[PDB]
Amino acid sequence: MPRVLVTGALGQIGTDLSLALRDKFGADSVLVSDVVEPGAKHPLAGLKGVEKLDCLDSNGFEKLVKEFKPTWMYHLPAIMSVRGEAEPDLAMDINVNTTRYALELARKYNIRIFIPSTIAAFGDKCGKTMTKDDTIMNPSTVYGVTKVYTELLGTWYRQKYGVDFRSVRLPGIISAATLPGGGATDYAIHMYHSALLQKKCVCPVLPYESLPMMYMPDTLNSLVKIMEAPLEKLTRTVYNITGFSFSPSELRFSIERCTDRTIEVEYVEGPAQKIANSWPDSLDDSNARNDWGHQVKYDIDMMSEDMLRQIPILHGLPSL
Amino acid sequence: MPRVLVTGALGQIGTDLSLALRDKFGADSVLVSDVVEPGAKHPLAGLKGVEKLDCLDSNGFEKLVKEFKPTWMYHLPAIMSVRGEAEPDLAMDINVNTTRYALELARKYNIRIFIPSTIAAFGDKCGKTMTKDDTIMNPSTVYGVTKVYTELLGTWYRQKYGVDFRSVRLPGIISAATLPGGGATDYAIHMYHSALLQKKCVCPVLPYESLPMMYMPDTLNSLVKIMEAPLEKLTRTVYNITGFSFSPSELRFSIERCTDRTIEVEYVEGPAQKIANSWPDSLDDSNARNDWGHQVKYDIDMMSEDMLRQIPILHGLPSL
Numbered sequence: 001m002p003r004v005l006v007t008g009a010l011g012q013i014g015t016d017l018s019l020a021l022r023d024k025f026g027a028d029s030v031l032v033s034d035v036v037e038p039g040a041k042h043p044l045a046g047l048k049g050v051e052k053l054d055c056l057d058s059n060g061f062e063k064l065v066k067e068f069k070p071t072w073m074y075h076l077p078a079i080m081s082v083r084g085e086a087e088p089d090l091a092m093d094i095n096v097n098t099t100r101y102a103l104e105l106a107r108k109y110n111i112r113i114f115i116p117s118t119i120a121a122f123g124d125k126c127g128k129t130m131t132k133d134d135t136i137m138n139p140s141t142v143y144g145v146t147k148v149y150t151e152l153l154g155t156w157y158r159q160k161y162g163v164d165f166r167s168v169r170l171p172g173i174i175s176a177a178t179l180p181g182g183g184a185t186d187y188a189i190h191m192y193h194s195a196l197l198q199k200k201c202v203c204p205v206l207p208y209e210s211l212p213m214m215y216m217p218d219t220l221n222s223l224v225k226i227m228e229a230p231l232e233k234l235t236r237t238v239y240n241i242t243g244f245s246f247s248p249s250e251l252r253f254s255i256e257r258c259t260d261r262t263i264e265v266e267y268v269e270g271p272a273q274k275i276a277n278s279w280p281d282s283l284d285d286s287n288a289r290n291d292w293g294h295q296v297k298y299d300i301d302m303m304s305e306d307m308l309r310q311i312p313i314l315h316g317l318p319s320l
Numbered sequence: 321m322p323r324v325l326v327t328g329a330l331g332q333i334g335t336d337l338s339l340a341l342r343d344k345f346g347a348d349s350v351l352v353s354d355v356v357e358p359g360a361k362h363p364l365a366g367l368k369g370v371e372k373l374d375c376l377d378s379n380g381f382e383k384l385v386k387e388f389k390p391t392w393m394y395h396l397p398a399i400m401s402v403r404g405e406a407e408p409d410l411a412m413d414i415n416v417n418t419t420r421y422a423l424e425l426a427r428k429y430n431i432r433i434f435i436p437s438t439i440a441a442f443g444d445k446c447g448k449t450m451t452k453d454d455t456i457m458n459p460s461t462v463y464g465v466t467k468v469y470t471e472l473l474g475t476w477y478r479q480k481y482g483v484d485f486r487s488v489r490l491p492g493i494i495s496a497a498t499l500p501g502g503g504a505t506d507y508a509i510h511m512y513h514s515a516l517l518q519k520k521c522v523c524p525v526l527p528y529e530s531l532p533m534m535y536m537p538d539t540l541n542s543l544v545k546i547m548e549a550p551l552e553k554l555t556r557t558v559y560n561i562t563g564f565s566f567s568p569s570e571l572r573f574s575i576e577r578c579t580d581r582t583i584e585v586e587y588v589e590g591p592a593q594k595i596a597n598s599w600p601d602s603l604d605d606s607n608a609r610n611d612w613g614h615q616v617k618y619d620i621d622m623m624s625e626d627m628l629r630q631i632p633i634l635h636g637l638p639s640l
């Protein structure tokens with residue numbers, strides 16, 4: 001049974017991952033942290049082992065690692081695709097420098113370390129249909145650039161020092177509990193809110209821009225599964241994973257068929273569209289399926305149904 | 321015509337390019353800077369147009385760009401392949417943070433900016449025969465990882481801000497003036513010194529390990545040429561360029577022809593061998609040839625004859 005450290009824990013992924021790990025391994029085995037404190041309505045308010053730590057504070061990060069002695073780390077802090085174009089200084093500081101600290105500490109303290117990549121690591125030369133694990137990487141956002149740097153530097157730590165570095169290229173992740181940072185796939189979460197609130201959604205991704213996507217339960221499954229796998233089962237450090245692909249028009253159809261209500265949607269092309277246009281439509285994740293058993297339980301309608309049930313309960317929005 | 325700032329100007333490439341730029345444009349149009357001062361023996365010693373600047377100091381870097389007002393920048397400082405593996409914190413700071421300040425200044429101050437990349441950006445999935453401009457980048461050195469970053473970041477500045485960023489992936493560069501900075505191809509330069517001193521060469525690279533190489537004069541030509549080209553002539557931001565490939569054994573023979581005398585090399589793998597073996601054997605530089613006229617005037621024996629003459633003159637070793 002591992003001791004698990006999660007950084008950037010109050011975000012979209014960390015919120016749910018923190019809870020899944022605690023319930024799988026017990027709360028005493030799981031320490032989580034973030035640059036800020038949870039608000040009183042955050043799902044991690046009031047839980048112990050939830051610390052304040054700025055990962056840009058090298059010394060603090062090392063003090064926490066020293067004191068807790070994790071055997072696993074999920075290093076989740078990142079400024080994301082859309083926000084990063086607006087705050088590229090912040091993107092480069094966090095995505096480069098925290099990642100560099102997390103790797104050195106993994107090396108120094110003998111930690112199996114997970115740092116997520118993303119479909120944003122790809123750009124327009126990747127081969128957008130069923131994009132492979134190994135291809136040309138020409139990301140067109142600074143976030144993507146820092147993510148390729150992350151894959152490569154982590155892979156360098158594995159080969160140079162034997163650090164057990166593992167990663168997946170996350171597709172767009174959909175969840176109910178905590179709202180998304182500043183990403184291009186955020187529209188997909190926002191559309192469910194808009195539908196429950198009965199208010200017009202202004203969508204900055206164009207209606208037929210397909211992206212790889214996944215629902216959180218599947219994502220959690222896979223984030224635990226790749227960290228549990230014996231290193232000998234892994235043929236690579238970085239794996240594509242996908243759930244299913246969809247476009248905004250498709251998601252809208254899904255939501256409408258579950259609510260039996262039309263939703264008002266105005267499509268604009270914000271920065272999210274030009275970014276998302278540079279990304280794959282779909283991924284090939286067969287290496288992940290084959291090496292460690294990546295699997296997806298949810299399709300789009302099962303996800304919409306769960307999201308429509310959970311958001312009212314978790315956020316108080318207009319229910320049934 | 322241009323005003324040219326060179327940073328990292330006192331190293332192997334910067335020494336000769338600084339001189340060539342001054343010749344071409346007038347000493348008044350060229351400002352060269354480095355974190356150290358030239359030593360008494362240095363080709364740039366006691367010249368005007370030679371400043372002291374540490375490029376990690378972002379305000380200092382900006383101060384000098386504000387005072388000099390370049391239209392062109394050659395940003396050369398980097399920790400290289402072999403020295404990087406030994407001192408990776410140093411390599412990560414310089415190669416990532418100085419590049420970042422330099423791009424940021426090129427944007428703010430409307431500067432056409434060159435930052436070299438390298439064959440070290442490639443790794444063992446690149447396709448090592450006539451390696452292409454677009455391919456898999458899996459560098460096995462932190463130097464290489466930082467250079468992929470450099471490529472992608474400069475290109476993102478181009479795409480996002482309209483920064484005129486240009487780069488070549490340099491092969492191993494050979495010259496006599498200033499001794500090399502701790503790369504995997506330094507054995508070449510050192511084999512010339514061994515021969516002239518009639519001492520035994522300890523070569524850390526294996527005898528038949530082919531690598532792309534180029535002799536300086538050709539290199540100086542291309543670096544000025546890619547910077548002269550009208551932007552509309554450029555189809556990309558990053559170009560492979562090569563001179564000719566050689567292995568240590570071919571270089572031995574070329575020194576031997578030129579000296580009409582046996583020269584004694586002992587092959588004893590150091591860290592350079594694994595690094596070099598992960599690199600290309602040869603590069604396809606047809607895009608560079610076609611877009612802006614990359615061209616190569618020396619072959620191996622012309623380089624050796626020139627090198628065996630200049631090293632005694634410039635370093636005061638025994639002659640012919």
Ligand SMILES: NC(=O)c1ccc[n+]([C@@H]2O[C@H](COP(=O)([O-])OP(=O)(O)OC[C@H]3O[C@@H](n4cnc5c(N)ncnc54)[C@H](O)[C@@H]3O)[C@@H](O)[C@H]2O)c1
Nearest residue numbers: 008010011012013035054055076077078118170172173181
């Ligand atoms: N959610 C998705 O759709 C998605 C998709 C692909 C990849 N990812 C990756 O997963 C990771 C988490 O993403 P997310 O969606 O949870 O992001 P998020 O923005 O929802 O949360 C990021 C968390 O990091 C914390 N943080 C920021 N700076 C920090 C610092 N200096 N020190 C400590 N904590 C800091 C933030 O406060 C926030 O709690 C990132 O690496 C992201 O790139 C997410």
Ligand SMILES: NC(=O)c1ccc[n+]([C@@H]2O[C@H](COP(=O)([O-])OP(=O)(O)OC[C@H]3O[C@@H](n4cnc5c(N)ncnc54)[C@H](O)[C@@H]3O)[C@@H](O)[C@H]2O)c1
Nearest residue numbers: 328330331332333355374375396397398438490492493501
């Ligand atoms: N020499 C080659 O064969 C070769 C091959 C491929 C790429 N390159 C690239 O060309 C560039 C120059 O290489 P080089 O061989 O001339 O390296 P070098 O080691 O000879 O010179 C580097 C110079 O950078 C200076 N420097 C270091 N830190 C600095 C800082 N903070 N601020 C200002 N200056 C600093 C050093 O004083 C040194 O003079 C590098 O980016 C290198 O990667 C060189």
Ligand code: NA
Nearest residue numbers: 180181183186
């Ligand atoms: Na997001």
Ligand code: NA
Nearest residue numbers: 500501503506
């Ligand atoms: Na060198």
